[PDB]
């Protein structure tokens, strides 16, 4: 696990001692007091339970049942009972007529066509209820938590009854983003990007396939006939337009409609009056190598993984300078220390715009990396 420092806790005269620590996923934090067993706090998941479906964008349409009405030039306008149906999309162009095709006089003759709209494959857009976000702490005792329920209590053998006043800070600000779900894959897309899409959408209450003409276009009419240009599945345009977006793994253990993702947690533990212990970490200046090179997450942050074989118990100095050492590289990773030797430690970094230089190391054996960022 991971030990705490001195100022990570405070023991008072009467009452108890409080620990304010931030816990990201799959990173433990231990609480050790002499003549008492060590603690192990593990944040299992930070997930959502059954998000609400806002709309349903169609991206693979099947058009059938094409019917036409033909009116000769200057004899009125053609009408069809399918223009009012919610199943069909209709278009109104004109077909040149004359003595050949049997119409009275020349000119552009009216013609109306309609085609049945049957959406086969459709991606859905979910919106999160920010207060109902689940996050689980497995301190073994199992504890579940909500953004509403920031405090849940549990007594342990050795520390008395403990109350954990917690708080969750998100990572993508669901107040402006959606959760797009394709056939099997999922994504986190912007709300306005999903609403400025040129694809038909089904409403929340069920409604109808509003704005069907984004997928239905007919060939120019001949004398009295139409051919329907079946614009195929624009999945080739969507999965390409969804290349630079953050993914969300569906689920592994819990249930269906239980979407997991990473984030940030802040907790405060209410332990009894105990004389706790502090542990300090030095800096990592030894040889180290990249396990996974710094890659994008989608929301601006770059995530890098490193291995420290020599002098493990330390935090890694990550510097992102404008090269010099002066850095404007705002750091996201908390407790960037190594658990054991030959291990991997995650490092999440938020570089600024333009071109920066990642700096990992001091003096000898510096792991440098460049990362162009043109986020808009």
């Amino acid at each position, epitope marked *: 696990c991971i030990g705490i420092t001195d100022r990570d806790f405070i023991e008072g005269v009467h009452g108890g001692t409080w620990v304010s620590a931030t816990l990201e996923q799959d990173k433990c934090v231990t609480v050790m007091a002499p003549d008492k067993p060590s603690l192990d706090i593990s944040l299992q998941t930070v997930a959502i339970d059954g998000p609400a479906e806002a709309r349903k964008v169609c991206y693979s349409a*099947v*058009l*059938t*049942h*094409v*019917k*036409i*009405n*033909d009116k000769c030039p200057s004899t009125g306008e053609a009408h069809l009972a399918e223009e009012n149906d919610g199943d069909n999309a209709c278009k109104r162009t004109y077909s040149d007529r004359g003595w*050949g*095709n*049997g119409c009275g006089l020349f000119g552009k003759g009216s013609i109306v*066509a309609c*085609a049945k709209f049957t959406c086969a494959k459709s991606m859905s857009l979910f919106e999160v209820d920010q207060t109902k976000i689940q996050y689980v702490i497995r301190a073994i005792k199992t504890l579940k938590f909500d953004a509403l329920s920031g405090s849940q209590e549990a007594e342990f053998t050795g520390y008395g009854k403990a109350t954990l006043e917690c708080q969750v800070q998100t990572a993508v600000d669901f107040g402006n983003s959606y959760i797009a779900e394709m056939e099997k894959d999922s994504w986190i897309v912007d709300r306005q990007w999903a609403q400025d899409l040129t694809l038909p959408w089904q409403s929340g209450s069920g409604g109808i396939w509003r704005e069907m003409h984004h997928l239905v276009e007919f060939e120019p009419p*001949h*004398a*009295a*006939t*139409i*051919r*329907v240009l*079946a614009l195929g599945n624009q999945e080739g345009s969507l999965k390409t337009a969804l290349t630079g977006a953050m993914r969300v793994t569906k689920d592994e253990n819990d249930n269906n409609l239980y979407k997991l993702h990473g984030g940030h947690v802040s907790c405060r533990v209410k332990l009894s009056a105990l004389t706790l212990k502090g542990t300090s970490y030095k800096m990592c200046t030894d040889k180290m190598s990249f396990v996974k090179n710094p890659t994008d997450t989608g929301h601006g942050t770059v995530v890098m993984q490193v291995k420290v074989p020599k002098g493990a118990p330390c935090k890694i100095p990550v510097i992102v300078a404008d090269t010099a050492a002066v850095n404007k590289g705002i750091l996201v990773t908390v407790n960037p220390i190594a658990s054991t030797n030959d291990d991997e430690v995650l490092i999440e970094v938020n570089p600024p715009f333009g071109d920066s230089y990642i700096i990992v190391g001091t003096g000898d054996s510096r792991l440098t990396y460049q990362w162009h960022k043109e986020g808009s």
Partner: antibody, heavy 126, light 109 residues
Framework: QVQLVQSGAEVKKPGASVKVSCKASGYTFIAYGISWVRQAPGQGLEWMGWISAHNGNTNYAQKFQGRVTVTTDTTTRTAFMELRNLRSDDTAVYYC???????????????????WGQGTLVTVSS | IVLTQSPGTLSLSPGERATLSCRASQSVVSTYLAWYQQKPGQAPRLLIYDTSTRATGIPDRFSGSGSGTDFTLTISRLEPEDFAVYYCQHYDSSPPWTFGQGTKVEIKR
């Protein structure tokens, strides 16, 4: 309403020719090509040939390829069928039926109700 | 493209439930199957176009269905009028109309 009007009774000796009319009325005849079906007495139905009005290309059954010839008359609003040299089993009742015009899974009326005309009682015997 | 209509001769008393099968070669999005009713001495009266949408004036009890290669014409309550020969026609992306081989529904005793 919408209906197809066919020709009257015809009697021809074997080897002669028969031309059956089918006057469409009530819809846009420029689309909706007219197909032909027959019925031998007792025997079931079988499709002989097919024609269109727009894109006048036609198609015929393989068994009746060398005999039948289907023509159209756009101004007169009529669909024809000429039957060549007549055998004995060719005695039947011949129907003309409304049908789509291109048969390409969506053009115009690929999913529309096919109307049928009256009977054309062709009795061939010496 | 072959068709298979079963059963051939049906013996059902009035009031019972009928079920015909026009087993087609391949059922795809472009598959048209018009059902028919032929009384001896009359032209066929169009029953259902496409696969399940009733024709003009056809009573409510007549209804079609499609599942796999086999299609089904279902009559809920048979009536003395509804005893005749029933047919099915098939055409898909090609001119030719393939017709059924007949299904006569007679009174049982």
């Amino acid at each position: 309403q919408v209906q197809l009007v066919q020709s009257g009774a015809e009697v021809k000796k074997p080897g002669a020719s028969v031309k059956v009319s089918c006057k469409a009325s009530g819809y846009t005849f420029i689309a909706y090509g007219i197909s032909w079906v027959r019925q031998a007495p007792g025997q079931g139905l079988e499709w002989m040939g097919w024609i269109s009005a727009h894109n006048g290309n036609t198609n015929y059954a393989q068994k009746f390829q060398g005999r039948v010839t289907v023509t159209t008359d756009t101004t007169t609003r009529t669909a024809f069928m000429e039957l060549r040299n007549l055998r004995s089993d060719d005695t039947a009742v011949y129907y003309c039926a409304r049908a789509p015009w291109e048969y390409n899974y969506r053009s115009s009326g690929y999913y529309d109700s096919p109307y049928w005309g009256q009977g054309t009682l062709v009795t061939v015997s010496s | 493209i072959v068709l298979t209509q079963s059963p051939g001769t049906l013996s059902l008393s009035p009031g019972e439930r009928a079920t015909l099968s026009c087993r087609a070669s391949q059922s795809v999005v472009s598959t048209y199957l018009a059902w028919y009713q032929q009384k001896p001495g009359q032209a066929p009266r169009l029953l259902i176009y496409d696969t399940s949408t009733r024709a003009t004036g056809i009573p409510d009890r007549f209804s079609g269905s499609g599942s796999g290669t086999d299609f089904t014409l279902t009559i809920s309550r048979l009536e003395p009028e509804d005893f005749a020969v029933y047919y099915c026609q098939h055409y898909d992306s090609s001119p030719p109309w393939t017709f059924g081989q007949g299904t006569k529904v007679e009174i049982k005793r």
